[PDB]
Symmetry: D2
Subunit: 410 residues, 4 copies
Amino acid sequence: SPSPWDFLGRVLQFQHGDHKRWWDVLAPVFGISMASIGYKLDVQYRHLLVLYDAVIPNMGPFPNSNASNITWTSPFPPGPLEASVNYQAGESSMFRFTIEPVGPHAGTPADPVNELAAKQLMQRLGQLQPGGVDSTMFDHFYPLLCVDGPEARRQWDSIAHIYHKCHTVTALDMQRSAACTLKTYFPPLLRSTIMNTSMVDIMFDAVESFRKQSGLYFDYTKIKEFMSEEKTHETMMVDRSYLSFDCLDPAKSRIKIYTEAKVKTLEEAYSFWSLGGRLSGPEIDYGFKIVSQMWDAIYSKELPGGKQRENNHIQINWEMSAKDSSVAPKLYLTVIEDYDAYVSSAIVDLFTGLGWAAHVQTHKKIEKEAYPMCDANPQSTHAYVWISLAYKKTGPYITVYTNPGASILE
Amino acid sequence: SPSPWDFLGRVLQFQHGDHKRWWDVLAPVFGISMASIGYKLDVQYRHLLVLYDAVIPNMGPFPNSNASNITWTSPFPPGPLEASVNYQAGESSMFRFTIEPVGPHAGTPADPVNELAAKQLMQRLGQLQPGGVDSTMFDHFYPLLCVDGPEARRQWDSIAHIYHKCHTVTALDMQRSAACTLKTYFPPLLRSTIMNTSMVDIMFDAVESFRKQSGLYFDYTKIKEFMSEEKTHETMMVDRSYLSFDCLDPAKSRIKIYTEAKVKTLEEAYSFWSLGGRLSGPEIDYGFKIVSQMWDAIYSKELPGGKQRENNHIQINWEMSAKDSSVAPKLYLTVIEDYDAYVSSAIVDLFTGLGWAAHVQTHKKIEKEAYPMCDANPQSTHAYVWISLAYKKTGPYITVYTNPGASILE
Amino acid sequence: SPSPWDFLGRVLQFQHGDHKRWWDVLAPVFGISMASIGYKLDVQYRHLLVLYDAVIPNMGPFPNSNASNITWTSPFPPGPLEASVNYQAGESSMFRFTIEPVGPHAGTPADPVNELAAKQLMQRLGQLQPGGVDSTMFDHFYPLLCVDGPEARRQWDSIAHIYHKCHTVTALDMQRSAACTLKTYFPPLLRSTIMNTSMVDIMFDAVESFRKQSGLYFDYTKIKEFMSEEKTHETMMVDRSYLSFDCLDPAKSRIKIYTEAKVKTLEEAYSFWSLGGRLSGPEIDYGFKIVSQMWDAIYSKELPGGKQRENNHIQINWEMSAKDSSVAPKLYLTVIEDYDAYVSSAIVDLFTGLGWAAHVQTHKKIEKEAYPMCDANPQSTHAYVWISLAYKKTGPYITVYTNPGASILE
Amino acid sequence: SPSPWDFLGRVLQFQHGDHKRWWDVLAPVFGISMASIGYKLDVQYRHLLVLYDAVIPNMGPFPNSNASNITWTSPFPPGPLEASVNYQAGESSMFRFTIEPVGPHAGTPADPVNELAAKQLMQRLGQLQPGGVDSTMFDHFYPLLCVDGPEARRQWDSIAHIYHKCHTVTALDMQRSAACTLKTYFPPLLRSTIMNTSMVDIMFDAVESFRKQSGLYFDYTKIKEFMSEEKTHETMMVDRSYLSFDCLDPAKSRIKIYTEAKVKTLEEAYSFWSLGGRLSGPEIDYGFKIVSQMWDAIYSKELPGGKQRENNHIQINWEMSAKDSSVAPKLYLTVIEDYDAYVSSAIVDLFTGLGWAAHVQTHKKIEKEAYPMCDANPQSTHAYVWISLAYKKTGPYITVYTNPGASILE
Ligand SMILES: CC(C)[C@@H]1NC(=O)[C@H](Cc2c[nH]cn2)NC1=O
Ligand SMILES: CC(C)[C@@H]1NC(=O)[C@H](Cc2c[nH]cn2)NC1=O
Ligand SMILES: CC(C)[C@@H]1NC(=O)[C@H](Cc2c[nH]cn2)NC1=O
Ligand SMILES: CC(C)[C@@H]1NC(=O)[C@H](Cc2c[nH]cn2)NC1=O
Ligand SMILES: CC(C)=CCSP(=O)(O)OP(=O)(O)O
Ligand SMILES: CC(C)=CCSP(=O)(O)OP(=O)(O)O
Ligand SMILES: CC(C)=CCSP(=O)(O)OP(=O)(O)O
Ligand SMILES: CC(C)=CCSP(=O)(O)OP(=O)(O)O
């Protein structure tokens, strides 16, 4: 019995060779992950056809040997920023993946700001599931945080120095229902650089305007307070922050404020995890015990090439609920330049301690089948990229983010 | 939840508009049938993608208003000759469909004999399922019964008078396993017209040569005897005969000899059903009781336009087993020019008498969902085309053949 | 020797059947026009491939029998708003065509404002000719006059009453050089309806801001004066006005202000042609003599169905030069609901009087070859749509606009 | 002004990525050659679209790094066997190219004999030019010399030892008229290996049968006599012989018998060039003086890697005219494993001696623009493959055959 991705690659007609190459790289990874976590074959077919129809045509050029064709500059290797599996209690596992929608002529004089690809992906996905994409939050936040083509082209001298001219990132939560929840991330770096306004101010002003004109509670007081301090700016790269929302009914959606911090201790990490004691409770302590566990387990081990850990790179989101005044943190450990073996051992020890044996086996199956380089090459550095840790009232919430184009780098 | 054909038509990229139009006509029919008989969604996706990849590109031009584009002449309306559901005991139901593979330029000076389309379909299907298409029987019977392009073009003056220059028909048994069994039919009319040899002789000589060079028992004595008589030729249109084989291991395949007969009584029908008393047993009597039942039930009712039944059009196959000397008949009643309502009532009465209530509901569901014209238009004549009746040792074996392009004629 | 459109339709691979159908309708028309006016075969191939690559994929659904698939409402029949041939002295003839870029899912919940198609066309055309599309004027005028998707979706209640939610129209001057000059038209009806500001004010404020931030002279004083009067509004449908610019270096581009007027006399027509005596000179008088000639020649003749001419429908542009303070008028007579025979006779008499015999034969050749319905059907009403008249210092400037999808309406 | 291949690659939609890659390799070469020899842009577009539509889809997989995807074995690198420019007197230059039509699944269990691709190419080309492909000669010679799929699959044990299971090669003479003359080559190695008959016998029996059933004179007496001798077989690899015909009206076509010979002297070369003194006259002597000139000029120079010339590899055709009893030779020197610089110097010296300065500059332009590796790499071995020499009554006839996929090997 062939697998959905094999059979589909056999039958599917592709509009461009780059789509076929992206397919050959990614469809096995995504399918193996969905299968290992237990998605039904109906659902695998539907999600792989979403990937074929809506995502891959908006993924951009497929890298050649010298990457002479990647005209859209990025610190991230071409392709999805990540494919992720989130593990919770009750053997709950969801597949997700993030893409910075890149057009095929982005970075060229015709699309110097990559303005259409996210919109094309939105449109195609909405056609594939009418009623699955609500553009209310997108329509409010796009003018404020995002920069259109015209504005970016008039104000080019202001932003040409920026290496990654990203303005919209799109993630798909590929649900076990064959439903794909779209999530939009806006890095407002271009907005700030053109308006010479601060990230904090534009983001939270957009949030407050949405509050006003929607009647929904998105409490950002604590986040703004913490993020405007100077002790935070000492470690924070606030220019690396972004705003995320689920593209749904604003009453069922969220707002999330992301920022990057290069820290050295778990005190500086608790600083971001609790916004300076402003957030407290049992969930905070449980989540930070998980954080310290994975910190000691991953960042204690040595790096490749005997390189020293100058500091530890973390990202952080604070999630604001449209129903309540409840800021909840999610801490991302960056592990892209660590040993995939040590990362996997840390994940396995964590799951084992939490009683998640099924998740251990799912993670190992995904590693073995979809990321063979982890065992073939003992000095593997390309598969795993991020570990997200959170503690909801449901329990722990651990997302493992991997590079599904590691094949390309090995 | 969308259906596989809806979602696929949304996502699938088609190489030609005619493929898209054929899809819009046929995918709902085929999917509704597969669903009603209980095929899993995995299997529906796989079979609809076979239809999209291998079949529809070899179905030919999609008819316009005036059919100015159907350059390949045929008595059958463009598209599949039939989509069929076979019903047996134990609530067993299989979906099948028959296509005369027509190229897009067949009947034009470039492909005046339609030589490649069957081969293209064979190749594509074999790629989609390596090991599912055995070409042994095809390779033996193609030179004998079929005519290649070169031979047909040198000997054109001999066959240009033929209206339907068909040489290969291909049917797919779309199994509940998502496996597609390919069956090949060869009408040797062109072979006979060029060699001015008799159909009987070329067909049974090919059968005997396969016997010799394979060591398999295909007893054609009784069939040859019956079909060479003159009383048979009085009713038989032997020039309408053809040879069918399943494209599998010859030891697991069959050979089937088909012929057309326009008869007037059930005595002349028993003549073909038993080869003149040569075939006998309980299966023969049971099957012919079913035949008489459906005869009285369908051909007694009046025709549209008050037209009189000059005679009754039947086809007949005799199936020879590669294991035994066991000729088994299958009798086809032609109902294309009858009332679909009376045909459906006959089918329902038959199933009810046999104790097949699930099959009654499956047939009615397929009629309602995939052939709405049967209820919308009380004078419906386009959906149902054939009723095949047989009695295997397993029990009755009744196949309902419908025109899945009835949409086009209504 | 086949023609470029025949051979290309034979070889070209189309992404969608609608593109193939649009091709079958339009490529003969466009090719016949380009050929009749004398474009080299190299140029015909290049322009037809532009049409195949950039235009037709952004033309929208191809109308079926009942037009059940045209979800984007418009008073204009689906397809190009016009294909035009402009005739000047010296046997100068240029081919042009106008398209309202419509996406394939425009008017549906996924693209309710048709936001991407014009941008996709711009991008594709810029890729096909890097340096041929300057977005400076587009980037300045798009935020002001045009409405993005987000704004249109937040402010939907304000504009849902509008039947034609058009915001960007794109014309291509297909030059004899195989260069395609892109021209962008913005109808600011949505901008005005959302901001409840007047068309005059938003348009001329955008023009003045471009003046300021570009240092180019675009004198709109006379146009604003005339268009804000009340006597003008008595006849003018100012809500039908739009702003056009050539997508080039603003110093080599133009600005043009278009408005519709349903008038009854040539006094009311001179009112628009001279902005109320504000524009004067020999060019004005010559051009208006041509206007009166064609008025008497076309609108004197009777209509089909014996319907009476309630009034005469004209459009008008005033062209402002980036170099000088020189407003120049161009008057459009609407002839869509006249007899194509009388329109053609008027055109021929005009050309003959002007000494344009080559143009007479070019026009008759285009009528005969690309619009046969004009002779086949004596009561032809679908081919010709507009006659534009102007008198530049070079001489007369007469553009004949035709519906290149008349095939679809006959 | 872009070139036809650049613009077309920009606009053309490709059915498969391999077609796009083959295009990127070959369209510049073919276009540069056609342009350098003076084909009009109309003609370049038409021929490149033939290449895009009919040829490249039947060229087969595009080789990856390790050629893991070339499942169809061949001594020749994947792609065209050659692109050629023929030079004659009067500054006459014609572009040609040869392809062994390979399907995309040839060499796999579904197409183990590559049976359809030549037929698909024939059909597509005939559609692109109805009346340009006459299948009379093809229809007569295909059953005799070529092996169909069924025969090759029944008789597999007889031919599986053959490395190159080629049966049909197709060349296109891309005329300055934008007309493409198709030429078919049949290597009957499979026919002989299955029938265990000699190449000579099957080929000349097919020729004699065509004579009989056509009334055309194809004198093969001298060729048969020479090729059946034993002294010839001492040097001749008769199993490497093939039969060529132009796919036209047999009265305007030719028959050509090709064979390979690895010789050591020009006496052994004259043996093939004159069939052992059987062919004589001034043309023979002139052509062989040209042959000796190029022999001394090319095979005297040393090889790369200091490897010794064991012997010199030549091919030879004898052309029989459907009008006369006139066998004419054409001698092919193999130069694939020589220095491209010495080959080019020999060609240039030859042309110069013949007074062909325009041809010298055309050849140098093609080398510089389409084969830059010849100057970039002084040790170039991949561009030039063959030099054909003949002396018709018109004068010399020198064809330079190059590998248009040298890019892939450098
Ligand atoms: C790409 C963009 C500039 C911005 N920056 C980031 O670092 C993260 C990337 C990421 C994916 N999964 C975990 N982290 N997301 C973003 O949207
Ligand atoms: C089409 C061909 C000439 C030949 N003739 C026929 O009548 C039947 C058609 C058929 C399909 N299902 C039931 N009957 N089959 C054949 O192969
Ligand atoms: C379509 C749009 C609303 C707007 N309105 C019009 O009437 C004209 C149409 C037109 C095409 N060629 C001559 N006249 N142009 C426009 O841009
Ligand atoms: C490929 C086939 C087996 C056979 N063998 C050959 O050697 C030549 C190849 C060739 C191309 N141009 C000059 N020589 N042609 C053929 O048809
Ligand atoms: C996805 C990129 C753009 C940032 C990392 S965050 P993630 O959101 O994918 O995880 P969650 O939705 O918060 O569950
Ligand atoms: C299918 C056409 C060509 C003839 C009617 S016969 P059928 O074979 O489809 O039915 P069976 O295989 O005999 O079961
Ligand atoms: C083209 C539509 C949108 C309006 C009619 S005006 P036209 O501009 O095509 O003619 P000109 O450029 O003014 O020459
Ligand atoms: C072309 C391959 C198959 C063999 C070399 S011969 P060529 O025929 O291309 O040259 P001519 O037609 O003889 O002019």
